[PDB]
Curated annotation (Swiss-Prot), chains A, B:
<dbReference type="Pfam" id="PF00202">
    <property type="entry name" value="Aminotran_3"/>
</dbReference>
<dbReference type="GO" id="GO:0006782">
    <property type="term" value="P:protoporphyrinogen IX biosynthetic process"/>
</dbReference>
<dbReference type="InterPro" id="IPR004639">
    <property type="entry name" value="4pyrrol_synth_GluAld_NH2Trfase"/>
</dbReference>
<comment type="similarity">
    <text>Belongs to the class-III pyridoxal-phosphate-dependent aminotransferase family. HemL subfamily.</text>
</comment>
<dbReference type="GO" id="GO:0008483">
    <property type="term" value="F:transaminase activity"/>
</dbReference>
<dbReference type="InterPro" id="IPR015421">
    <property type="entry name" value="PyrdxlP-dep_Trfase_major"/>
</dbReference>
<keyword id="KW-0663">Pyridoxal phosphate</keyword>
<comment type="pathway">
    <text>Porphyrin-containing compound metabolism; chlorophyll biosynthesis.</text>
</comment>
<dbReference type="GO" id="GO:0015995">
    <property type="term" value="P:chlorophyll biosynthetic process"/>
</dbReference>
<dbReference type="GO" id="GO:0030170">
    <property type="term" value="F:pyridoxal phosphate binding"/>
</dbReference>
<dbReference type="InterPro" id="IPR015424">
    <property type="entry name" value="PyrdxlP-dep_Trfase"/>
</dbReference>
<feature type="modified residue" description="N6-(pyridoxal phosphate)lysine">
    <location>
        <position position="267"/>
    </location>
</feature>
<keyword id="KW-0413">Isomerase</keyword>
<dbReference type="InterPro" id="IPR049704">
    <property type="entry name" value="Aminotrans_3_PPA_site"/>
</dbReference>
<keyword id="KW-0149">Chlorophyll biosynthesis</keyword>
<protein>
    <recommendedName>
        <fullName>Glutamate-1-semialdehyde 2,1-aminomutase</fullName>
        <ecNumber>5.4.3.8</ecNumber>
    </recommendedName>
</protein>
<keyword id="KW-0627">Porphyrin biosynthesis</keyword>
Length: 427, 427
């Protein structure tokens, strides 16, 4: 297994960019170090600059649900770019994607496109406060909503993997506006409202968690949050940047039947290009400029290429058997992983919903960030590198959910379980 | 002049998105509210959904410096997308663009790519505070640096062309560590330091303003800021999202010979795709994760398509005579505009530097946002519509700088002045 080319490029990168990466998680610091440099991706695979091929379960962190470089998406982009990549003015494509999102997501009646999940989360945070007139927000430990200042509190994703404290650079005054509580803990949420009567703008969370490992909400958790937010006239906000269009066409809110007041979208809606969006009840979205006083702008927002990619991706997701297929192969993958762990004598737990899964090296069960942190990180680090060597590319962190795509074949799953057997038998 | 198709699409849009746009400035609110819907853009032109052709002086707000849909850029993207649009892992292209940016910009020794100017500004703001350990930031009235909550206080850009406030939702407290002063007012800046000893992380500004109309720094202004920030061990941050690679290959810091500690980039570096970046002195950039504790991430950051477009755009800008050409046509355009205004009896002032200009309906001169606000907005609104009717597309706001590109021919400039004469003669 050669990684000479990757080591070379990464070494040079560290002298040009912080940590030699554009995003912290790509770091490999908790997986051993030695990230692999990608050259190209297609369908369910990724190829190294060293020539190594991998069955990819990261899907560029969610966007590639239809498989990498889907021919229809590529074709749509090639035709579209001939008309220019950015206008800086309205175009018909924005209307089309807007309508598609509105029809797809239950809580969304009006939507505003942005360029990332971070921007969408920044905006929704600002809108929640402007609409309610309250400054406090409730978020859960282990959840991640982009790097906006107020979100850098008990955050997951790269924050968790790197084991850093609430990030510095954010003033004390702003941080005081973020109340945290353990995921799946309704009682802790009620206490926060009781201790801050009339100050909570609302509750934001990943309806299904992917940033502190894969975590599904307990029975009644989402329902409870909906109930109490309504009780105190606070907003319930679903960050479906990862779950949107992956858990179901309408995301978690649709599958689990709980309608929030606002939801953030990203990843999949961009089809592989930078795209984010936030929407919800019409009367709340009315506050967004230029319709309302809440100024939020974006030069590249709604650019024709991004809209094109998003539109084609959603159209492909509307075809027959899409989500059934995702659940079929992912359930077999997840079940197989757990069966193998047990057979090879390693404590483990996990689960999956549609094309989203998780696998932790701990007996669990895992209901929150604390439980997930019981995972044997050193064993995970060995497992990950071993899988890499067997041709399987997993997220380089125990605290990141894995993803499958429509391009993953039954054969790909077979090969992945075979690799898992080989690696875990040697762990 | 028919705009039937535009009115139709825009009317439908207002029922799907806030104000029917993805960004405030696009609703034409300060200029009558009848925006034109774009279908395509090429070279120095834009085409309506109604079939109308315009000589474009917005250039999608800065990115299109080499002309719209430049054939070499399109070709580079078509070749690149065959390998996938997003990896979610390191790629050789990031190193190439990183090196190019480092070599091009004086203050940048290390750089981190993001997906918009807003993300870059959010990050640099956090970095300034994390590095110095101070929470207060000084910004100028009329300047704009994204919608980073901690910034909605004297914000510029659209904030002027739509009677915007401190964009609600941003706790009056979050924006409590942000101090403002008039642009070009060194005395006001010294006073702020004196009134907040040891609390100022630094000073951030557009080295040349484009968001409160076009405004150049007075003699000694940039130099003074550098001097005083050094005096109080504070950072000097240049927001060159607009000016970067437009005012000069090395931006304003290079052309005017003043080196900041940090600078944000955007627009042009993306070649039309969503791209942003922040960099500066190596020791400061060292704090960015995963190299340091300051957290900042982005799923689409450093994606292949974005890097590809940025690389090709900067390569085109390194060809012989690029900036000389921009200055040549833009000086004639700007001078012509002023000459015509005088000949037609209308008080005006403006100016240009490279391919960036401004034209205000006020005698001026304009040294800051206050002066710019003396512009006759009603006259500007009539001028803009009249120009539209003559086939000229200008920024739909008196407080937005205009831009030219390498694709604008001498003939395009001639036709633009001819149009200006016709419109102003009838004003
Ligand atoms: C749930 C969630 N929300 C928001 C974000 C931020 O996304 P982006 O990189 O698009 O800013 C992330 C990280 N992808 C996320 O996992
Ligand atoms: C000087 C400046 N800084 C930051 C930004 C934010 O740019 P973006 O839309 O790319 O976030 C802009 C664009 N208005 C800008 O002109």
């Amino acid at each position: 297994f050669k990684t000479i080319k990757s080591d070379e490029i990464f070494a040079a990168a560290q002298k040009l960019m912080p940590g030699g990466v554009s995003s912290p998680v790509r770091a490999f610091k908790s997986v051993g170090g030695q990230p692999i440099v990608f050259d190209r991706v297609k369908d369910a695979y990724a190829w190294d600059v060293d020539g190594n091929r991998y069955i990819d379960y990261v899907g560029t962190w969610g966007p590639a649900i239809c498989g990498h470089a889907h021919p229809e998406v590529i074709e749509a982009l090639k035709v579209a770019m001939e008309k220019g990549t950015s206008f800086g003015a309205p175009c018909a494509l924005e209307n089309v994607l807007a309508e598609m999102v509105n029809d797809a997501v239950p809580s969304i009646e009006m939507v505003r496109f942005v360029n990332s999940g971070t921007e969408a989360c920044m905006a929704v945070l600002r809108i929640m406060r402007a609409y309610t007139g309250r400054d406090k927000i409730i978020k859960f430990e282990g959840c991640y909503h982009g790097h906006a200042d107020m979100f850098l509190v008990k955050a997951g994703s790269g924050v968790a993997t790197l084991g850093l404290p609430s990030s510095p650079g954010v003033p004390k005054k702003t941080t005081a506006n973020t109340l945290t509580t353990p995921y799946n803990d309704l009682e802790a949420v009620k206490a926060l409202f009781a201790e801050n009567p009339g100050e909570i703008a609302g509750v934001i969370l990943e309806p299904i968690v992917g940033n502190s490992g894969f975590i599904v909400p307990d029975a009644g958790f989402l329902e409870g949050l909906r109930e109490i937010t309504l009780e105190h006239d606070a907003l319930l906000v679903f960050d479906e940047v990862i779950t949107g269009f992956r858990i179901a066409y309408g995301g978690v809110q649709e599958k689990f039947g709980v309608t929030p007041d606002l939801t953030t979208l990203g990843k999949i809606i961009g089809g592989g290009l930078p795209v984010g969006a936030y929407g919800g009840k019409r009367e709340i979205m009315q506050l967004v400029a230029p319709a309302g006083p809440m100024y939020q702008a974006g030069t590249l927002s709604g650019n024709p290429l991004a809209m094109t990619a998003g539109i084609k991706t959603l159209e492909l997701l509307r075809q027959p058997g899409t989500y059934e297929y995702l659940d079929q192969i992912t359930k077999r993958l997840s079940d197989g992983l757990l069966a193998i762990a047990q057979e090879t004598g390693h404590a483990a737990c996990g689960g999956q919903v549609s094309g989203m899964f998780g696998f932790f090296f701990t007996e669990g069960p895992v209901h929150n960030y604390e439980d997930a942190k019981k995972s044997d990180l050193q064993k995970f680090s060995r497992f990950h590198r071993g899988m890499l060597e067997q041709g399987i590319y997993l997220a380089p962190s125990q605290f990141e959910a894995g993803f499958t795509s429509l391009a993953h074949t039954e054969e790909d799953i077979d090969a992945t379980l075979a690799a898992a057997r080989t690696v875990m038998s040697a762990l």
